[PDB]
Design a protein around this ligand. Structure first.
Ligand code: SF4
Ligand code: SF4
Ligand code: SF4
Lengths: 353, 180, 127, 196, 166, 384
C-alpha cells in the first residue's frame, strides 16, 4: 500500500460486514446456480419451483438449517465439536477483501478493497492452511475414527497441493516484484495478462485449486460412497451449514483469485469497468469448474498424491527457477512470453495423439 | 487418451444446451398407456345394473388374499346385480394389494377392472382399505383427492392423461389424448 | 413354561407378573406382546410370552387400553421389561380366535409359532 | 462324453440312475462312496459346481428313503481348456437324525456359501467346512426355515370392521396330500401331463 | 425451538421445512429403484427442495422406507431413525413396507410403523414415481398442518414427535 | 483396522454389510455379511399356486425379471408338457433382451456413479425410462410385469407397441456408441479399472463366478449358446469376451452385450408373424373370455383354473438361462398338487459373491466400492 490510502476503521468494519453478508447471499445463490447447471448438464431440468428461478428456495433451506436440532454427539470433544466450524468459517471468509474489484476510490468514494496488505499472498497462504486445520480438527473431535480417516485423507491431499501453491505463486512475484495484489494487477495493466508469461505455473495453480475440495480428486472424501469424509457426518443443524458454507466460500475464493493473479483482474484493455469484468471472469471460471464437477471422474487420493507431488510441484519450481534467471538478468520481458506460448503449444499438441 | 476429457466436456455441453426432455408433474399430465395397472373400478351394464355378482373370484386370484367379498341376496323389486347374488361388502386393502391384474382377469362379469389412478398415498393404515363406494366408476378421484376437494372446495384434477380408455373400462371417464 | 395372571384383569396380571419376574435379568430374553389388528391400538388387547431361553412365562389377554386400567398397565409392563435390560421386544398379530387357543396349544408349538410370526417392535408404541 | 463315462462308472457298482424324459439326469451315490466318488468327479473334469440344493420330504405324499436329501450340481464349462458341456446332479440322502455330509469346499470353493445356506434353511451340517455360519436368517432366529416342520408364519389380512382372513384356511389350492373339498381327487387333479 | 410459539413464525418455518424436505432414502428393495427413477430426466423430485441427497442421517429430515423391511435389518434402520436430528419425518414406501404385502410370512415386517413412526403410507408395487412425489407432497401439506384423515381429525406436523423412545 | 462398513453406509448399494480387514490404504480382506433382505420366496412359493407364483418370480431379481419369468415358465412347461406357439417364443426373447438392456443400463449407471462422475447416470437411465414405457403399453406395469404365462404370453400386443420399439431401436445404437466412446477411451478410468478386479478363471470357476464377469476373464461360456432354450439357437449371435478380467473389460463387454441385445431384438422383430398367444390346453389355459356366457365347461374350467389351478405330475425339473448376472434356473419339485412342493433357485448372484474377498484382495480401499458395483450384484437375488 505505497500509493493507496487507508479508509477509517469504521469504514473498514462497514465494508467487512458488507463483504461477509454478500458472500453469504452469493454462496446461497451459487448453490442454486450449480444445482441448475448440473441439472442442465444431465438433461433433467432444475427447480423451476419455489422461485420461479428458485431464488426463494435458499430461504427455505436456511429456515431448515436452524431449528434442525444442533446436536452435541456423545464421545465427542465438548469444545472442539462447536469450535471447529467456527475456525473453518472464520478463516474462510477473510482473504477475499484483498481482491481488487476496481481502481482506487471506485467503491463510490473510499476503497474497492478492505485490506491491501504489503504481503498478500502470504496472508492468503496462512489462512488457507488454517482451513485444513479446521478440517482435520473437526474430523478428530467427532469421536468417529471412520470419519477421522477421511479427515486425514482430506488434510494430507489439501496440504500437499497447498504446498504446491507456493511454487505456483513464486513465478509472477519475480516480474511484478511486490507482494500486494494491486501492484500485480497494475503490472497486468501495463504489460498485460501475466499468464501469457507464466501459463504453465498458472496451470499448476489451477489444478492446485481442484485439490482444495473443488473437485476431481473427489476422494476428499465426502461421506458418500467411499471411506467417509471428516469434518461432517456428526453435525446436524448449523455447524454442518457452516462447513458447507466455508467450503463453498473457498471454492469461490479460488475462482476469483485465478483471474486476479494470472489473467486479467478486472483491468480490461477495453471499457476498463471496475466490478463487472471481475464478476464475469468469476462466472466463467465457475462455469468451467462446474463443467468439471459434472463431467470428470475421481482420483482415489493415491494417483492424486502422485500427480500433485511428482508432476505439478517439480514443474512449478522448474518454471520458478527459469523465471528467476530471466528476471534477475532482466534480459527481455519477451522471453517469458515466447517460452510460455511455446510450452502451451507443447502441452496442447500432446493431447490429440 | 487425453482427448477423452475434452470429448466428455463437449458432449455434456451439447446436452446442456439441449433443454427439453423431462415432464413437470403435476403441472404436466403424465401420459399413461391404456393397459396401465391402476385403482380398481367396478363397471355397470348399460341398464345400470352392477356387474358384480359377488362371486368372490377376484379374491381367490389374489396372491395376498387381500379382497373381502361378503355376498348377499338380490331384492327383485330394486335389484343390484343381474343374477340372484350381489356383493354386499366389497373391500380391497391397498396396502395388501400388489396390483397384478389377476382379479380383472378372473372376474366373469367384468365388475372388477384395474383403473389408472395412482395418487392413493394416505396417512393412515385404516384409511387405505378402499371400499365399494370408493371404487365405483361413478366416483371421481382417490380418497385423499376427494377429501381434499371437499375440505378445499376445488374439484378433483387427475394427474394423468391417457390416449383412450380400453373397452374393458366401459363407462370410465378419463382425459383422452387431447380430445378435450 | 409358566402361566401367571388372568384374562381381562389387567392389574391382577400385572401384579402377578411383578411377583413372578423377581430378579431375573432379561439381557438376552425375548418379549412377545401378542395382539390382533395391527393398526387399532386404542382398543387393543395383549398377551405376553417371555422367552428367556431357559424358561418361559405366559400372561393371558389382560393388557392394553381395551380394559380399564389396561393402558397404564401395559405402559408399566413395557417400562419394567426395559428397566430389566431388555432390548428385544416383539409383537405378533394373530387372528382373534388364535389369541385364545394359542395359550392352550402345547408349549412347543405355541412358542415356535410366536417366535416365527413375531415382528420387531419399538417399545415406544406401548409407553 | 464324460457323462456317459459317469453313467458307465456308476452302473457297475449298483448305483440307481434316475432319468426323466425331459433331458435331466440323476446319479444317486450312497454317502460312504459319496465323498471319494465326487472327488473323482472333480478329477473327471467337473470344473464348475452349480448348486447345493437341499430337500425336506416330510409332507411328501409318497415315502422317501430319508427325510432330507442334498443334491449337488456338477458341470464342465464348454469354453474352457477342454470343454465337453456335460452337466448332471448327484443326490445324497441325509437322515433326519444324521444331518452330516462332507463339504466340497476343499474340492470347490463354490460350496463355501452354498452349504452354509443349507445349514441355515435345513438342519444339515456339512462336515469340514471352514465356517458354517448362519447366512440368511437373523442370528436370534430359532430353527431352520425351509424344512416342512417349520411354519411359514403368516399374519392375517386386515379390513374395516372385524373382517379378517387367515390365508391357510382360505386356500383353494391343494397340496399333494390335501384331499380337497370333495370326497376324492382323480384325473387331472391327481397329477396331469400332456402327451406332446 | 421446534418451529413453534409464534403465529407467523410457525407458519413460516412450516413453509421452510415443507419445501426443505431433504429425503434420506433407505434403499431396501425394488421400491428403491422406483425411487431412484424419481430422480432421472423424466420425473425428478429435485424441484420441491429435494435435490441434495445426504447419505448421512444426521443431515436429512425425511426418511423414506423404500422396500421390504426384513427383520435382520429392523434394528439397524431403527438406529438410523434414533440417530437423526429431531425435526425428522418417516415415509413408508410400497406394499411390503406399508403392510405385509403379498409376503405374509416369517421374514418380513408386516408394517414398518412397528420400528419407526410412519408419517404417510403410499400403496403401489412399485408405487409409480409420480405416486412417490404425491406422497412427498402429501407430507408437505401434512407438516403445514394442512392434512386431515377420513375421520375429520387434523394430523400433527411431525410423527415421531409423539412417542416415548425408551 | 477391522473396519465395519455398515449396511447401506457408506452408500453401499444393495443392502450389505462388510467387515474390511484393512491396514493402511490396501485391502487385506473383505468379509461380507448378507441376509438383511431375506424374504422367503423359496418358502412362500411352497404355499402359492403355479399361476400365482408368476407374481412372485420377477420380485427376486427386480432389474432383470423376465429371465426369472422365462425360467419359471419353461420349468413348469417341461414339467407338464405345454406347447409354446412360435410367436410367444419370439415375444419372450424380445422382452428378455429388452429387460436385459434395462438391467445393464442400471448396472453401469450405478457403477459409474458409485465412484466416478454423477452425470453419466442420467443419460443411460433416461433411455431406460423410454424402455419402461414399452412395458406399460403391453403389461400396464413398469416392472414386476405379469405378462408371461405357462403356454407363452398373456395376450397379444397393441398396434402402438412396435413403432415405439422401432423408434428406440434406431436411437439406441448411437446412444450405446456414445457411452462406449466416453468410457472405452478411458482418460482417467483406465488408471482406475484396468489393473483392479483380478479374475483368474481357475478360482473364478472354483467359486462358481458365472455372471458375465467370467467371460471378462476369457471363458467362452454362454447359456444362450451352450444350452439353447428359447430359440436363441435361431439367432445370429456374437459373444463378447475380455482379455484379462478387470473392471474395464467387464464394463466394455457389457456395453457390447447391450449392442448384441439390440441386434437380437431387431432380428426377432423381422421374423415376427401374427398368430396365437398361448397354449390352449384347457388344463393349462382358462377358456377364452367370450364363451363364458355360452358354454358350461367354460365356466367350470375358468372357475377351477383360477381357484384351484392345475396339478402337474409328481417330479423334479430344472432349466438353465442366461441373465444379466449369470446362469439362472429353478429346481422345481412338484408333488402333484396345485402348489409346488419346493422351488429352489440357483441364484447366480449368490455364487457370484463368493469371489469378492478374492477380487478386492490387495486392492485399494476406495476401489472396494467400484469392484463391488462392477461385480453387478442385485441383493434381491443373493438374500432372496
Ligand atoms: S391386483 Fe391386487 S387385488 Fe388384484 S389379485 Fe393382484 S394383489 Fe390381489
Ligand atoms: S368383481 Fe367379478 S370376480 Fe369379483 S366377486 Fe364381483 S363378479 Fe365375481
Ligand atoms: S412393494 Fe413391490 S416393488 Fe416394493 S419392495 Fe415390495 S415387491 Fe418390491
Amino acid at each position: 500500500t505505497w500509493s493507496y490510502p487507508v479508509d477509517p476503521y469504521w469504514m473498514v468494519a462497514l465494508k467487512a460486514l458488507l463483504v461477509v453478508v454478500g458472500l453469504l447471499t452469493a454462496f446461497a445463490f451459487m448453490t442454486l446456480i450449480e444445482r441448475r447447471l448440473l441439472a442442465r448438464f444431465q438433461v433433467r431440468m432444475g427447480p423451476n419451483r419455489v422461485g420461479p428461478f428458485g431464488l426463494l428456495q435458499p430461504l427455505a433451506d436456511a429456515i431448515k438449517s436452524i431449528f434442525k436440532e444442533d446436536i452435541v454427539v456423545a464421545q465427542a470433544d465438548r469444545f472442539l465439536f462447536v469450535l471447529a466450524p467456527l475456525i473453518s468459517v472464520v478463516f474462510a471468509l477473510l482473504a477475499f477483501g484483498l481482491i481488487p474489484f476496481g481502481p482506487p476510490g471506485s467503491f463510490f468514494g473510499y476503497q474497492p478493497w478492505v485490506i491491501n496488505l504489503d504481503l498478500g499472498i502470504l496472508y492468503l497462504f496462512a489462512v488457507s492452511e488454517l482451513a485444513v486445520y479446521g478440517i482435520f480438527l473437526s474430523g478428530w473431535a467427532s469421536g468417529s475414527k471412520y470419519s477421522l480417516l477421511g479427515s486425514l485423507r482430506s488434510s494430507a491431499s489439501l496440504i500437499s497441493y497447498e504446498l504446491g501453491l507456493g511454487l505456483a505463486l513464486l513465478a509472477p512475484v519475480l516480474l511484478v516484484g511486490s507482494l500486494n495484489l494491486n501492484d500485480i494487477v497494475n503490472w497486468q495493466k501495463e504489460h498485460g495478462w501475466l499468464f501469457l508469461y507464466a501459463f504453465p505455473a498458472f496451470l499448476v495453480y489451477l489444478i492446485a485449486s481442484m485439490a482444495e475440495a473443488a473437485r476431481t480428486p473427489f476422494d476428499l472424501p465426502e461421506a458418500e460412497q467411499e471411506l467417509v469424509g471428516g469434518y461432517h457426518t456428526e453435525y446436524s443443524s448449523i455447524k454442518w451449514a457452516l462447513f458447507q458454507m466455508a467450503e463453498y466460500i473457498h471454492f469461490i475464493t479460488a475462482s476469483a483469485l485465478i483471474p486476479t493473479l494470472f489473467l486479467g483482474g478486472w483491468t480490461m484493455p477495453v471499457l476498463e469497468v471496475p466490478y463487472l469484468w471481475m464478476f464475469l471472469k468469476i462466472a466463467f471460471f465457475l462455469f468451467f469448474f462446474i463443467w468439471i464437477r459434472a463431467t470428470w471422474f475421481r482420483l482415489r487420493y493415491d494417483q492424486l498424491l502422485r500427480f500433485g507431488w511428482g508432476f505439478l510441484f517439480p514443474l512449478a519450481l522448474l518454471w520458478f527457477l527459469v523465471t528467476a534467471l530471466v528476471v534477475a538478468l532482466d534480459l527481455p520481458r519477451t522471453y517469458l512470453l515466447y517460452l510460455s506460448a511455446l510450452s502451451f503449444l507443447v502441452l496442447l499438441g500432446a493431447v490429440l495423439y | 487418451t487425453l482427448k477423452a476429457l475434452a470429448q466428455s466436456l463437449g458432449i455434456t455441453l451439447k446436452y446442456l444446451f439441449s433443454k427439453p426432455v423431462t415432464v413437470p408433474y403435476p403441472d404436466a399430465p403424465v401420459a399413461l398407456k391404456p393397459r396401465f395397472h391402476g385403482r380398481h373400478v367396478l363397471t355397470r351394464h348399460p341398464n345400470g345394473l352392477e356387474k358384480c355378482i359377488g362371486c368372490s373370484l377376484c379374491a381367490a386370484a389374489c396372491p395376498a388374499y387381500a379382497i373381502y367379498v361378503e355376498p348377499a341376496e338380490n331384492d327383485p323389486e330394486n335389484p343390484v346385480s343381474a343374477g340372484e347374488r350381489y356383493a354386499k361388502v366389497y373391500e380391497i386393502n391397498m396396502l395388501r394389494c400388489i396390483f397384478c391384474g389377476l382379479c380383472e382377469e378372473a372376474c366373469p362379469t367384468g365388475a372388477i377392472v384395474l383403473g389408472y389412478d395412482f395418487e392413493m398415498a394416505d396417512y393412515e393404515y385404516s384409511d387405505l382399505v378402499y371400499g365399494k363406494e370408493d371404487m365405483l366408476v361413478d366416483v371421481v378421484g382417490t380418497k385423499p383427492q376427494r377429501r381434499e376437494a371437499k375440505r378445499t372446495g376445488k374439484p378433483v384434477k387427475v394427474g394423468y392423461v391417457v390416449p383412450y380408455v380400453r373397452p374393458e373400462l366401459e363407462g370410465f371417464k378419463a382425459p383422452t389424448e387431447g380430445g378435450k | 413354561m409358566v402361566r401367571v395372571g388372568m384374562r381381562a384383569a389387567p392389574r391382577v396380571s400385572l401384579e402377578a407378573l411383578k411377583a413372578a419376574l423377581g430378579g431375573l435379568k432379561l439381557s438376552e430374553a425375548k418379549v412377545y406382546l401378542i395382539t390382533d389388528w395391527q393398526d387399532k391400538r386404542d382398543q387393543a388387547r395383549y398377551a405376553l410370552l417371555l422367552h428367556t431361553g431357559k424358561k418361559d412365562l405366559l400372561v393371558p389377554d389382560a393388557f392394553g387400553p381395551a380394559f380399564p386400567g389396561g393402558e397404564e398397565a401395559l405402559s408399566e409392563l413395557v417400562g419394567l421389561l426395559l428397566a430389566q435390560g431388555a432390548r428385544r421386544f416383539y409383537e405378533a398379530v394373530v387372528s382373534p380366535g388364535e389369541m385364545t387357543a394359542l395359550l392352550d396349544l402345547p408349549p412347543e408349538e405355541l412358542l415356535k409359532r410366536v417366535m416365527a410370526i413375531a415382528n420387531p417392535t419399538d417399545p415406544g408404541i406401548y409407553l | 462324453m464324460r457323462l456317459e463315462r459317469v453313467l458307465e462308472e456308476a452302473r457297475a457298482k449298483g448305483y440307481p440312475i434316475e432319468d426323466n424324459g425331459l433331458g435331466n439326469l440323476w446319479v444317486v451315490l450312497p454317502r460312504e462312496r459319496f465323498k471319494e466318488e465326487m472327488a473323482h468327479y472333480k478329477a473327471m473334469g467337473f470344473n464348475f459346481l452349480a448348486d447345493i440344493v437341499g430337500l425336506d420330504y416330510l409332507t411328501y405324499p409318497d415315502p422317501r428313503p430319508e427325510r432330507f436329501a442334498v443334491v449337488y450340481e456338477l458341470v464342465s464349462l464348454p469354453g474352457w481348456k477342454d470343454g465337453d458341456g456335460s452337466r448332471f446332479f448327484v443326490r445324497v440322502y441325509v437322515p433326519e437324525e444324521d444331518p452330516r455330509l462332507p463339504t466340497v469346499t476343499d474340492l470347490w470353493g463354490s460350496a463355501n456359501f452354498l452349504e452354509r445356506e443349507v445349514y441355515d434353511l435345513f438342519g444339515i451340517v456339512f462336515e469340514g467346512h471352514p465356517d458354517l455360519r448362519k447366512i440368511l436368517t437373523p442370528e436370534d432366529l430359532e430353527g431352520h426355515p425351509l424344512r416342512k416342520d417349520y411354519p411359514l408364519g403368516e399374519t392375517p389380512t386386515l379390513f374395516r370392521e372385524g373382517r379378517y382372513i387367515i390365508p391357510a384356511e382360505f386356500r383353494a389350492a391343494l397340496t399333494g396330500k390335501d384331499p380337497g373339498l370333495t370326497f376324492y381327487k382323480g384325473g387331472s387333479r391327481k397329477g396331469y401331463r400332456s402327451l406332446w | 425451538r421446534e418451529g413453534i410459539l409464534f403465529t407467523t413464525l410457525e407458519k413460516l418455518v412450516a413453509w421452510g421445512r415443507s419445501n426443505s424436505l431433504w429425503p434420506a432414502t433407505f434403499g431396501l428393495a425394488c421400491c428403491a429403484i422406483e425411487m431412484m427413477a424419481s430422480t432421472d430426466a423424466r420425473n425428478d423430485l429435485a424441484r420441491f427442495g429435494s435435490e441434495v441427497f445426504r447419505a448421512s442421517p444426521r443431515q436429512a429430515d425425511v426418511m423414506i422406507v423404500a422396500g421390504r423391511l426384513s427383520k435382520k435389518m429392523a434394528p439397524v434402520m431403527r438406529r438410523v431413525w434414533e440417530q437423526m436430528p429431531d425435526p425428522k419425518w418417516v415415509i413408508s414406501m410400497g406394499a411390503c413396507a406399508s403392510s405385509g404385502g403379498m409376503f405374509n410370512n416369517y421374514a418380513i415386517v408386516q408394517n414398518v410403523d412397528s420400528v419407526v413412526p410412519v408419517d404417510v403410507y403410499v400403496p403401489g408395487c412399485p408405487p409409480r414415481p409420480e405416486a412417490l412425489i404425491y406422497a412427498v407432497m402429501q407430507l408437505q401439506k401434512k407438516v403445514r398442518g394442512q392434512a386431515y384423515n377420513e375421520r375429520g381429525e387434523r394430523l400433527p406436523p411431525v410423527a415421531a414427535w409423539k412417542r416415548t423412545r425408551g | 483396522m477391522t473396519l465395519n462398513v455398515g449396511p447401506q453406509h457408506p452408500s453401499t448399494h444393495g443392502v450389505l454389510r462388510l467387515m474390511v480387514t484393512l491396514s493402511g490404504e490396501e485391502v487385506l480382506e473383505v468379509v461380507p455379511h448378507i441376509g438383511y433382505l431375506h424374504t422367503g420366496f423359496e418358502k412362500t412359493m411352497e404355499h402359492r399356486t403355479y399361476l400365482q407364483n408368476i407374481t412372485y418370480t420377477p420380485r427376486m431379481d427386480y432389474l432383470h425379471s423376465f429371465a426369472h419369468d422365462l425360467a419359471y415358465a419353461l420349468a413348469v412347461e417341461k414339467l407338464l408338457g405345454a406347447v409354446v406357439p412360435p410367436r410367444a417364443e419370439t415375444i419372450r426373447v424380445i422382452l428378455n433382451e429388452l429387460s436385459r438392456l434395462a438391467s445393464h443400463l442400471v448396472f453401469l449407471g450405478t457403477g459409474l456413479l458409485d465412484l466416478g462422475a454423477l452425470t453419466p447416470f442420467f443419460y443411460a437411465f433416461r433411455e431406460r425410462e423410454t424402455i419402461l414405457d414399452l412395458f406399460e403399453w403391453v403389461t400396464g406395469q413398469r416392472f414386476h410385469h405379469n405378462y408371461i404365462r405357462i403356454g407363452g404370453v398373456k395376450e397379444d400386443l397393441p398396434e402402438e407397441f412396435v413403432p415405439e420399439l422401432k423408434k428406440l431401436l434406431e436411437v439406441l445404437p448411437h446412444r450405446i456408441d456414445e457411452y462406449e466412446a466416453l468410457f472405452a477411451e478411458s482418460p482417467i478410468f483406465y488408471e482406475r479399472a484396468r489393473g483392479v478386479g483380478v479374475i483368474p478363471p481357475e478360482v473364478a470357476i472354483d467359486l462358481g463366478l458365472t455372471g458375465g464377469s467370467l467371460r471378462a476373464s476369457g471363458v467362452n461360456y454362454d447359456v444362450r449358446k451352450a444350452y439353447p432354450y428359447s430359440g436363441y439357437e435361431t439367432y445370429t449371435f456374437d459373444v463378447p469376451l475380455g482379455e484379462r478380467g478387470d473392471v474395464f473389460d467387464r464394463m466394455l463387454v457389457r456395453i457390447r452385450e447391450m449392442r448384441e441385445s439390440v441386434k437380437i431384438i431387431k432380428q426377432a422383430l423381422e421374423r415376427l408373424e401374427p398368430g396365437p398367444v398361448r397354449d390352449p390346453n384347457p388344463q393349462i389355459t382358462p377358456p377364452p373370455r367370450h364363451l363364458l356366457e355360452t358354454s358350461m365347461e367354460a365356466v367350470i374350467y375358468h372357475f377351477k383354473h383360477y381357484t384351484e389351478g392345475f396339478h402337474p405330475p409328481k417330479g423334479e425339473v430344472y432349466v438353465p438361462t442366461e441373465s444379466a448376472r449369470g446362469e439362472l434356473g429353478y429346481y422345481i419339485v412338484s408333488d402333484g398338487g396345485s402348489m409346488p412342493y419346493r422351488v429352489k433357485v440357483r441364484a447366480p448372484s449368490f455364487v457370484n459373491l463368493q469371489s469378492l474377498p478374492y477380487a478386492c484382495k490387495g486392492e485399494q480401499v476406495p476401489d472396494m466400492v467400484a469392484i463391488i458395483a462392477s461385480l453387478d450384484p442385485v441383493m434381491g437375488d443373493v438374500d432372496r
